Enzyme design. Structure first.
Site, PDB file in Angstrom:
ATOM      1  CG  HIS A   9      -1.932   1.191   1.182  1.00 14.96           C
ATOM      2  ND1 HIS A   9      -2.913   1.371   0.205  1.00 14.96           N
ATOM      3  CD2 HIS A   9      -2.026   2.258   2.014  1.00 14.96           C
ATOM      4  CE1 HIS A   9      -3.529   2.532   0.419  1.00 14.96           C
ATOM      5  NE2 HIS A   9      -3.062   3.030   1.551  1.00 14.96           N
ATOM      6  CG  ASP A  19      -0.835   5.934   2.129  1.00 16.41           C
ATOM      7  OD1 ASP A  19      -1.939   5.828   1.555  1.00 16.41           O
ATOM      8  OD2 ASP A  19      -0.445   5.301   3.156  1.00 16.41           O
ATOM      9  CG  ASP A  48      -5.724   3.150   3.868  1.00 15.40           C
ATOM     10  OD1 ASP A  48      -6.209   2.700   4.927  1.00 15.40           O
ATOM     11  OD2 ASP A  48      -4.757   3.944   3.909  1.00 15.40           O
ATOM     12  CG  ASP A  51       0.309   1.243   5.364  1.00 15.40           C
ATOM     13  OD1 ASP A  51      -0.625   0.677   4.683  1.00 15.40           O
ATOM     14  OD2 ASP A  51       0.063   2.208   6.143  1.00 15.40           O
ATOM     15  CG  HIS A  66      -6.676   7.141   0.842  1.00 16.44           C
ATOM     16  ND1 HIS A  66      -6.289   6.433  -0.285  1.00 16.44           N
ATOM     17  CD2 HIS A  66      -5.886   6.674   1.854  1.00 16.44           C
ATOM     18  CE1 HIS A  66      -5.298   5.604   0.021  1.00 16.44           C
ATOM     19  NE2 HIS A  66      -5.035   5.735   1.310  1.00 16.44           N
TER      20      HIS A  66
HETATM   21  O1  LIG Z   1      -4.297   7.744   6.453  1.00 16.65           O
HETATM   22  C1  LIG Z   1      -3.630   6.482   6.504  1.00 16.65           C
HETATM   23  C2  LIG Z   1      -2.732   6.196   5.318  1.00 16.65           C
HETATM   24  O2  LIG Z   1      -3.411   6.384   4.081  1.00 16.65           O
HETATM   25  C3  LIG Z   1      -2.243   4.747   5.398  1.00 16.65           C
HETATM   26  S1  LIG Z   1      -3.423   3.992   6.550  1.00 16.65           S
HETATM   27  C4  LIG Z   1      -2.731   3.890   8.206  1.00 16.65           C
HETATM   28  C5  LIG Z   1      -3.851   3.906   9.245  1.00 16.65           C
HETATM   29  C6  LIG Z   1      -4.720   5.181   9.236  1.00 16.65           C
HETATM   30  C7  LIG Z   1      -5.489   5.417   7.938  1.00 16.65           C
HETATM   31  C8  LIG Z   1      -4.633   5.321   6.657  1.00 16.65           C
HETATM   32 ZN   LIG Z   2      -3.551   4.857   2.470  1.00 19.06          ZN
END
Ligand SMILES: O[C@@H]1[C@H](O)C[S@@+]2CCCC[C@@H]12
Ligand SMILES: [Zn+2]
Ligand SMILES: *[C@@H]1O[C@H](CO)[C@@H](O)[C@H](O)[C@H]1NC(C)=O
Length: 1016
Positions: A61, A63, A175, A312, A442
């Protein structure tokens, strides 16, 4: 022909509002599966004729900005994950990997040498590396506008088709914080066959799992037939990480995350670490893992099981690739070779999983339930409802909507011609699309990134706005200059944009004054653009150096205008008041612009020495005890003063509004003969809990219902003009303004929460509408869904996204509040509506962000407030899950999101200037929009292609005959048409070759895409 979206209630297996009404929500301890129950299975279900087929789907994942910026993550993390993905997949032919975020993949691929590009295409071709969704980002689904969801999807898939020769048909959304049916709506019209979601309320996961309704054909709430339906898989557990993906017991699943043995830092918080698989323990480890898989398989209907394997920024280190791959390979070898398990397990991709499910379906082994509704508001545990991010970082939420419109206008204006490469139009528009697409992430629009990352997104969107300005003003110059006289320098500013509402008054002094004088420059050309496909009138304003200015159109016809002072508000920390100052050096001129469909119209402002015949002057009244004078330079009318009192105003034929002595609306009277309907604006604040769970960027955890903002004795400024009147008041944290131009008022709030730590400021409307527990909010600017306030849920759970509007109604009356920015909101009591303005939060909410929200800045929020009689309207029945706007409310929304654009000619003289563009464009029915116009070819292509996205809303029939109206055929907008095709909404696949090269119009609530081809 078209389905009726109003009068027939769809019959579905699961309708989420109905399910919410019936379900319990009690948060009981389910055992190792904390939010479920102890799953049981029959070991004899699986045997040699009926095996469980298990697909282990490695993923990572990434971001695009969160704790680090896009570029920081790319450098530190993602370039390594992708470099190692290329190496390891290439060297290990059975290993597989799925990839979602095309923004990163494109950043990486263009840094690769040809040899590595070739290797990368080979692992895509052979199915080992598989793109899922293929959007630029994995967008927020709450605050994002559907137009930008489509933008970012198209940006990523156009990249994939050009460079990888693939178009994903399976989507992966693990997510976003809650899920919207706008996603299957867009995906299903973009060629998709399947999709996957993860973050839904833990009670919903428990409820659907018990019924094996976690896989369902998700249709739109108004879809009676089912043609919108898209197969959807909801994951069953608390997270997409490895502990919450192999089965119900994270203490066991954690032992099969092989990055958690020690050398990578990471460990298992349930206290049992993973062990290396060897011949000595493989049977025991296999027995444990299969038992997890069999329990997860009980929650689904086929013998095909999806096991995501990732987390992640995973698959970064070469050693991590080896430790995951080798250990699972040993498991697979043992499991698949032991018949008593009756399992065949392998690495797989997402598509491989869906293909096998549907093969199972087609074999008669399962039928799936139908579902409509949404998955807001999400809670991950206890009372932790993620309604905070519907408002977090609202400056950038509003900036999203501003940039959405400037992207559209820049692509549309520049689409009418082919441009020389030297103009760099394609360059600038690609940068604007990509910075806006990135912000749909997001952690972008949601306001859930770290402080410096929010700054990165803001700077990127400012560069995108500049790119759109450059393109728009070059385009206006070309469109409005006689062809034999047009002589462009592509780096020069022919026009500057003038925008009255961004950054907005009291946010940035950014607007240019038109400087005129009898000794210097008597006149100035201004140009208005109308992106909408119908004739439009709207009042526009400009700043000018004299009040003595009159307006004419292209033919020198006088145009009625109004001059007002330029008022700014100041937190006067000598007198401890928030009060207005009038400019003594510039003035506002206001007039009605009338502009062709998708067109331009030119007007001229001319100075004179005294009051012009066709220009009127507003009166001004300052209401406060202890007033002092307010001089206004040359402005002809002296300001008046009075003690605070109730006042009432009427512009044109429109409503009469009454105001309290604190300068807030109290009532609306629609017609001269009609009642004064009570409609009361009020500002209140929420706090944060002292003990236990704290609000932060994600979570909204108020310490009880909101308390009223104590207003003291505010200064009220009243401006009364023929064309525009207003009432403005300086309240603590908010300068609140009601503006009247003769229909539904415009509300503007200049919101500066200052140093009010642990406070959320809310604006509430109080009415006598007997709405009960019902209210309506929109999803992504696309559709309005019925909400029911539930007292079995805490306050924060009854907050929903308000991405563009909300309303309450009873048998006779509706009040609709339309927004220029996505914010959180609710109806907490009968006859109320409320929407959060800003929130400033001094603690972290323990989701990984590691900070509160203490970076607030002044933001100008805009709204329209529409009170309407609706007893004559044809509404859906009581059981229908949708609602629809009226004509007035839909027009009001359009006035906020896509207003006329204004251009000021930048030099003294415009040689070859023309009065209008687009007077021959068809003026389409009011419910139809051309959401996108985009030229798809560069100037060297023999066959030019232009794509159009056409969206038809559905408006309530309330007995305005409202007739008329030209058919819109987008395929004949440009000359020399040779073909007209209907395509997917991304323009990437032709679906129908159209007769006579005519693009039909679409049905209510439908969106279609067309591409016209032109010999050049
Ligand atoms: O904002 C975050 C990010 O997008 C990776 S995920 C980690 C936990 C909290 C929500 C999500
Ligand atoms: Zn995320
Ligand atoms: C693009 O897509 C398909 C793969 O199924 C193929 O028929 C076509 O040849 C491809 N072009 C290539 C290999 O670049």
């Amino acid at each position: 022909q078209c389905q009726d979206v109003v009068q027939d209630v769809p019959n579905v297996d699961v309708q989420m509002l109905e399910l919410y009404d019936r379900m319990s929500f009690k948060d009981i301890d389910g055992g190792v599966w904390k939010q479920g129950w102890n799953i049981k299975y029959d070991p004899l279900k699986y045997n040699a004729h009926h095996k469980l087929k298990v697909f282990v789907v490695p993923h990572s994942h990434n971001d695009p900005g969160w704790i680090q910026t896009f570029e920081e993550y790319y450098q530190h993390d993602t370039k390594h994950i992708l470099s190692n993905a290329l190496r390891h997949l290439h060297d290990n032919p059975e290993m597989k990997f799925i990839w979602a975020e095309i923004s990163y993949f494109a950043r990486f691929y263009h840094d690769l040498g040809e040899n590595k590009k070739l290797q990368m295409k080979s692992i895509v071709k052979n199915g080992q590396l598989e793109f899922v969704t293929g959007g630029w980002v994995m967008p927020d689904e709450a605050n994002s506008h559907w137009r930008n969801v489509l933008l970012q999807l198209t940006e990523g898939q156009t990249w994939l088709k050009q460079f990888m020769n693939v178009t994903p048909t399976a989507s992966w959304a693990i997510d976003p914080f809650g899920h919207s049916p706008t996603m299957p709506y867009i995906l299903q019209k973009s060629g998709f066959k399947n999709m996957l979601i993860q973050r839904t309320h833990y009670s919903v996961k428990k409820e659907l799992a018990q019924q094996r309704q976690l896989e369902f054909l998700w249709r739109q709430i108004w879809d009676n037939k089912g043609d919108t339906a898209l197969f959807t898989h909801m994951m069953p557990f608390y997270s997409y990480d490895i502990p919450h993906t192999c089965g119900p017991d994270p203490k066991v699943c954690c032992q099969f995350d092989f990055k958690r043995m020690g050398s990578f830092g990471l460990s298992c918080p349930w206290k049992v670490p993973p062990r290396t698989i060897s011949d000595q323990n493989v049977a025991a480890r296999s027995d444990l893992l299969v038992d997890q898989w069999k329990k997860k398989a009980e929650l689904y209907r086929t013998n095909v099981l999806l096991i995501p394997l990732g987390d992640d920024f995973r698959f970064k280190q070469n050693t991590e690739w080896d430790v995951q791959r080798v250990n699972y390979e040993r498991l697979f070898e043992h499991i698949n070779s032991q018949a008593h398990f009756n399992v065949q397990a392998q690495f797989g991709t997402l598509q491989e999983y869906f293909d096998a499910v549907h093969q199972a379906e087609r074999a008669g082994q399962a039928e799936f339930p139908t579902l409509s509704g949404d998955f807001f508001t999400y809670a991950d545990r206890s009372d932790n409802y993620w309604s905070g991010y519907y408002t977090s970082r609202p400056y950038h939420k509003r900036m999203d909507r501003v940039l959405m419109h400037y992207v559209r206008a820049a692509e549309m204006l520049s689409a009418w011609h082919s441009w020389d490469g030297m103009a760099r139009i394609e360059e600038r528009l690609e940068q604007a699309r990509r910075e806006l697409s990135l912000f749909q992430h997001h952690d972008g629009i949601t306001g859930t990134a770290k402080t410096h990352v929010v700054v990165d997104y803001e700077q990127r969107m400012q560069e995108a706005l500049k790119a759109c300005q450059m393109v728009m003003q070059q385009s206006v110059y070309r469109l409005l200059t006689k062809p034999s006289i047009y002589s462009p320098d592509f780096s020069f500013s022919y026009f500057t944009l003038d925008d009255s509402r961004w950054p907005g008054s009291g946010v940035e002094d950014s607007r240019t004054t038109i400087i005129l004088g009898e000794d210097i420059l008597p006149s100035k050309h201004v140009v208005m653009h109308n992106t909408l496909p119908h004739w439009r009138e709207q009042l526009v304003d400009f700043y000018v150096s004299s009040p003595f200015v009159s307006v004419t159109d292209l033919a020198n016809n006088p145009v009625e205008a109004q001059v007002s002072p330029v008022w700014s508000w100041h937190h006067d920390t000598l007198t401890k008041t928030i009060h207005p100052q009038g400019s003594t050096t510039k003035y506002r001129i206001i007039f009605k612009a009338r502009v062709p469909p998708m067109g331009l119209a030119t007007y001229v402002l001319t100075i004179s020495d005294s009051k012009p015949e066709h220009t009127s002057y507003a009166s001004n009244l300052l209401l406060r005890k202890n007033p002092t004078s307010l001089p206004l330079g040359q402005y002809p009318e002296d300001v008046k003063f009075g003690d605070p009192r109730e006042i009432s105003l009427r512009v044109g034929n429109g409503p009469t509004l009454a105001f309290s002595e604190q300068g807030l609306l109290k009532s609306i009277q629609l017609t001269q003969d009609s009642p004064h309907v009570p409609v009361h604006f009020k500002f209140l604040k929420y706090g944060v809990r002292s003990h236990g769970d704290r609000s932060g960027a994600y979570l909204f955890l108020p310490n009880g219902p909101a308390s009223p903002v104590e207003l003291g004795q505010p200064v009220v400024l009243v401006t009364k003009g023929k064309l525009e009147s207003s009432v403005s008041v300086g309240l603590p944290s908010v300068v609140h303004q009601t503006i009247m131009r003769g229909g539904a008022p415009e509300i503007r709030n200049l919101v500066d929460i200052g140093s009010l730590d642990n406070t959320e400021i809310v604006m509430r409307l109080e009415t006598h509408i007997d709405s009960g527990d019902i209210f309506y909010t929109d999803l992504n600017g696309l559709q309005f869904i019925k909400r029911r306030r539930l007292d079995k849920l805490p306050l924060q759970a009854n907050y929903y996204p308000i991405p563009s509007g909300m309303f309450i109604e009873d048998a006779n009356t509706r009040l609709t509040l339309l927004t220029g920015q996505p914010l959180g909101g609710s109806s907490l009591a009968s006859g109320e509506l409320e929407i959060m303005q800003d929130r400033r939060l001094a603690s972290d909410d323990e989701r990984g962000l590691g900070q509160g929200v203490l970076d607030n800045k002044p933001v100008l929020h805009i709204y329209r407030l529409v009170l309407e009689k609706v007893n004559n309207c044809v509404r859906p029945s009581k059981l229908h899950p949708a609602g629809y706007l009226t004509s007035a409310a839909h027009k009001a929304s359009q006035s906020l999101l896509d207003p006329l654009d204004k251009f000021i000619f930048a030099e003294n003289e415009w040689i070859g200037a023309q009065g209008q563009f687009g007077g021959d464009h068809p003026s389409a029915r009011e419910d139809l929009d051309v959401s996108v116009m985009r030229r798809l070819t560069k100037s060297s292509a023999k066959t030019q292609r232009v794509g159009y996205v056409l969206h038809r809303t559905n408006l309530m029939q309330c007995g305005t005959p409202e007739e008329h109206t030209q058919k819109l055929d987008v395929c004949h907008l440009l000359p020399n048409v040779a073909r007209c095709e209907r395509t997917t909404l991304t323009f990437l696949q032709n679906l129908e070759h159209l007769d006579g090269m005519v693009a039909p119009e679409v049905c209510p609530m439908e969106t279609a895409a067309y591409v016209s081809s032109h010999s050049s």
